[PDB]
Design a protein around this ligand. Structure first.
Ligand SMILES: [Ca+2]
Ligand SMILES: [Ca+2]
Ligand SMILES: [Ca+2]
Ligand SMILES: [Ca+2]
Lengths: 462, 213
């Protein structure tokens, strides 16, 4: 035991102003200058001192009976006062500036230790904390995890951000939930040994080979967002997956996903996908991200009646009509495609967010009854009219229609042209292969506001 | 334009913390480099930093387990600011819904309920009522759906089961004959309230019944 040598002012025990204020309330005193006894201090067994701007825990060594502490969201560096508090079983100290965790080395009763978002490199002092079942070390600067190799009760683990070598995990077969995000990992072969894994988060790494996952059939949650994946054949073994993120990879072949019918969320944004036929039987999906691929035909999507959230932006899609039966849709994004007809979207009476900039849309009238919209995008349309004949005097109908059914007057017209509703007219002295015009019109549908703008090209035949 | 999925999280989520919720994105990130941030209770006002965002990815994370019975929903706002320091979106309101787990046992309104009953009250006579509440979500789950039972009677005379309880309402009725004040003036019942329609978490309290002339 540590003991104060006599009754002492709280503020002479706890030299931190903010910690002293807290301990005054904990210890049932009126003023931080009031004295307390060692007996009073020995009554404190838990302490929730998160989010108080504490810079020093000097004084806590005299709280001999502590079992659980929260000092998260503070400004701690030195944690030497924990050194002899061997009754500690749970420590929360995420979001500090701790570098030296040597004072933890003898706290062998610890079962939970949260240290993410600190300045830790060296984790050798954790090596004898063999009763840990939860250890979080992400958002640090750890490169070497050999000190984890003897923590064979671990169930929940994370670390970062410089690890390449995962071999120290080999014996931690009690692991259920692992986050190795934002390291330097390419080789995940050791993970095949962790057959109790239910959740694996491994975003922002250099992983290309996922064959090690093959026997990890208890996986329900897997994130490989931001890696170098292409062959995902191994995922066909993981039929318990409900939540899968493979965004930001090089995947083209989705056939291995076709049997993962427990999937409710699937992210496949920023890949090399042109064929989503393999997704047609994934009817439990509520969330599907297919942005930044090479899609044209999205007809397999019409089967996915439970979708509430769908991204399709940055593809080469002309026909949006496969979404038309997905009436639970609340948020739909398909900006940067080639959609010219949104008549099918009239069906999406539950739609709230509708994002359709950089398409070929000319007529908002099908959207007019979508009054639950709160977010809308219709900027920067562009399309080419069917050719008309070059003549000295040549007129075409304006075809740009607001949600009201009213024609939107051109903003600009090439080659000195003019507008008299409904017709755009050019006097052209000699043959030109095309003329053009722009429009730009703010519009609100429901509560969703955008600028409906675009560039229309009119080819002229010789 | 914002590109954000709706955000729901169960309470009492398992670690490791922090956990990824959703990616937050503006489609104006194609015109330049965007700094993302969040404001609101649970972000930049108390409790601060329950929710945080990765600066460039827009990954929104939760740093600790939630408790629906303390805060059931959070209202955050996302912000998007260019490298030159100008906002490129208006702040977007983001609702975070915390969904229920059965983590509260029923709680009796009293530890000791008192009632009385007349000798020779007819079988079927309502005597008293006991009542428990449950802090879990009675709208979307059975986590607060309480069944009432009797565990014991003291004394067990003249019969073991002098009384019954309505498993839905907690009303305690006489169901047999032979009440006798002179011999057995009082009955101490242990009553149990259990959620999940009787199958779940449970709590016990006492009902003390005085036999009157
Ligand atoms: Ca908008
Ligand atoms: Ca709770
Ligand atoms: Ca309950
Ligand atoms: Ca609950």
């Amino acid at each position: 035991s540590a003991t104060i040598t006599q009754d002492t002012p709280i503020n002479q025990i706890f030299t931190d102003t903010a910690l002293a204020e807290k301990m005054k309330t904990v210890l049932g005193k009126t003023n931080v200058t009031d004295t307390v006894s060692q007996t009073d201090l020995d009554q404190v067994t838990t302490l929730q001192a998160d989010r108080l701007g504490i810079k020093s825990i000097d004084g806590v060594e005299y709280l001999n009976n502590l079992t659980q502490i929260n000092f998260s969201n503070n400004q701690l560096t030195d944690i030497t006062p924990l050194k002899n508090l061997t009754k500690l079983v749970d420590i929360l100290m995420n979001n500090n500036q701790i570098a030296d965790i040597t004072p933890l080395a003898n706290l062998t009763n610890l079962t939970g230790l949260t240290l993410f978002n600190n300045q830790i490199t060296d984790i050798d002092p954790l090596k004898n904390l063999t009763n840990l079942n939860r250890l979080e070390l992400s958002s640090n600067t750890i490169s070497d995890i050999s000190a984890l190799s003897g923590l064979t009760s671990l169930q929940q683990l994370s670390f970062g951000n410089q690890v390449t070598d995962l071999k120290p995990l080999a014996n931690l077969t009690t692991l259920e939930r692992l986050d190795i995000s934002s390291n330097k990992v390419s080789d995940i072969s050791v993970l095949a040994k962790l057959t109790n894994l239910e959740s694996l988060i491994a975003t922002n790494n250099q992983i290309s080979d996922i064959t090690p996952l093959g026997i990890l059939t208890n996986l329900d949650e897997l994130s490989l967002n931001g890696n170098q994946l292409k062959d995902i054949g191994t995922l066909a073994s993981l039929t318990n997956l409900t939540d899968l993120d493979l965004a930001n990879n090089q995947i083209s072949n989705l056939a291995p996903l076709s049997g993962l019918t427990k999937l409710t969320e699937l992210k496949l944004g920023a890949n090399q996908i042109s064929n989503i036929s393999p997704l047609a039987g994934l009817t439990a999906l509520t969330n599907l991200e297919l942005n930044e691929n090479q899609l044209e035909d999205i007809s397999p999507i019409s089967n996915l009646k439970n979708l509430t959230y769908l991204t399709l932006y940055f593809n080469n899609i002309s026909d949006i009509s496969p979404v038309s039966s997905l009436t639970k849709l609340q948020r739909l994004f398909f900006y940067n495609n080639k959609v010219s007809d949104v008549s099918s979207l009239a069906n999406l009476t539950n739609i709230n967010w509708l994002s359709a900039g950089h398409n070929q849309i000319s007529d908002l009238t099908p959207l007019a009854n979508l009054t639950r919209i709160t977010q809308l995008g219709l900027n920067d349309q562009a399309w080419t009219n069917a050719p008309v004949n070059y003549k000295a005097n040549v007129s075409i109908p304006n075809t740009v229609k607001n949600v009201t059914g009213a024609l939107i007057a051109p903003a600009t017209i090439s080659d000195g042209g003019s507008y008299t509703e409904p017709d755009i007219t050019w006097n052209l002295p000699s043959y030109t292969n095309e003329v053009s015009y722009t429009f730009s019109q703010p519009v609100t549908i429901g509560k969703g506001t955008t600028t409906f703008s675009g560039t229309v090209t009119q080819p002229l035949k010789a | 334009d914002w590109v954000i999925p709706p955000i729901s999280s169960p309470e009492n989520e398992k670690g490791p913390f922090p956990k990824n919720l959703v990616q937050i994105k503006s489609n104006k990130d194609k015109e330049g480099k965007v700094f993302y941030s969040i404001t609101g209770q649970g972000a930049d006002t108390p409790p601060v930093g329950v929710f945080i965002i990765e600066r460039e990815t827009g990954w929104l994370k939760v740093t600790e387990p939630l408790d629906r019975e303390r805060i059931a929903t959070y209202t955050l706002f996302s912000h998007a600011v260019s490298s030159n320091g100008n906002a490129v979106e208006d702040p977007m309101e983001i609702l975070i819904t915390v969904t229920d787990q059965n983590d509260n046992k029923p709680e009796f309104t009293q530890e000791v309920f008192k009632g009385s009953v007349m000798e020779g009250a007819l079988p079927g006579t309502s005597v008293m009522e006991v009542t428990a509440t449950d802090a879990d979500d009675d709208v979307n789950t059975y986590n607060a759906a309480i069944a009432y039972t009797i565990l014991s009677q003291d004394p067990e005379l003249p019969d073991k089961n002098m009384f019954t309880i309505n498993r839905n309402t907690g009303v305690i009725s006489v169901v047999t004959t032979g009440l006798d004040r002179e011999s057995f003036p009082t009955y101490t019942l242990v009553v149990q309230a259990a959620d999940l329609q009787g199958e779940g978490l449970s709590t016990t309290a006492t009902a003390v019944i005085t036999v009157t002339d």
